[PDB]
Design a protein around this nucleic acid. Structure first.
Ligand SMILES: [Mn+2]
Ligand SMILES: [Mn+2]
Length: 188
DNA sequence: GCCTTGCCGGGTAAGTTCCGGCGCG
DNA sequence: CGCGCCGGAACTTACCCGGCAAGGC
């Protein structure tokens, strides 16, 4: 559908490097933010914001894409109650992702929380249940993997891709053309 | 004599929630 | 009055990085 693919990729970034926030203010004002953060300004302005802007347009959401500069990172922010529930509802129906959405999610999840050097193929997160979902997805795709508690200080688990299948992983998932191409996959 | 990978500490690139605006029924 | 979009940025830590060494082949 391509809209389903971009959505799942973006969701991976959001759960990875950002989040969905339902704010309540004084009073009783409110706000619903869809947020991705990244240190690099080019990566937000050039690769993420275009994808989000396409999605904004295909759902007839007319919030704008805000790019806020913070002390330690840039924030791509959409203040929209409709876009918030679009992604929230997608997140609770995540085990029902078809295969096109599975590759797209793992892609964006790897961009956000993943070992960007690819010398090893690792992905970190405190959500063990979300990594077990991805683990089943990888297995059914023939990419063997493991989950251990990488960081005892903060309770962060790691999903390690076995390097046995490193070319299966990089060429099939990080490099698929059936949905948007990651930072270092579009070259290679 | 490699390679894979569990484990671990360093600290930065993330994440989270407050602020003060405005608009609209 | 009630609620939802802008634009900013302060406040902690969850990621990532990369070393080490144990275990396979
Ligand atoms: Mn994360
Ligand atoms: Mn990241």
């Amino acid at each position: 559908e391509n809209v389903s693919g971009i959505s799942a990729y973006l969701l991976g970034l959001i759960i990875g490097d950002g989040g969905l926030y339902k704010l309540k203010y004084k009073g009783n004002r409110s706000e619903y933010r869809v947020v991705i953060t990244q240190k690099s300004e080019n990566l937000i302005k050039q690769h993420f914001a275009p994808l989000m802007q396409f999605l904004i347009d295909e759902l007839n959401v007319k919030s704008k894409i805000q790019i806020v500069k913070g002390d330690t990172r840039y924030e791509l922010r959409v203040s929209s109650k409709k876009l918030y529930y679009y992604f929230a509802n997608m997140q609770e129906r995540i085990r029902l992702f078809n295969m096109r959405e599975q590759i797209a999610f793992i892609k964006g999840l790897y961009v956000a929380e993943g070992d960007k050097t690819l010398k090893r193929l690792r992905i970190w997160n405190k959500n063990k249940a979300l990594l077990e979902i991805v683990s089943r997805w990888l297995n059914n795709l023939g990419v063997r993997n493991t989950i251990h508690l990488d960081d005892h200080r903060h309770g962060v688990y790691v999903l390690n891709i076995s390097l046995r299948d490193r070319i299966k992983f990089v060429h099939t998932i990080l490099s698929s053309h059936l949905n948007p191409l990651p930072p270092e996959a579009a070259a290679l």
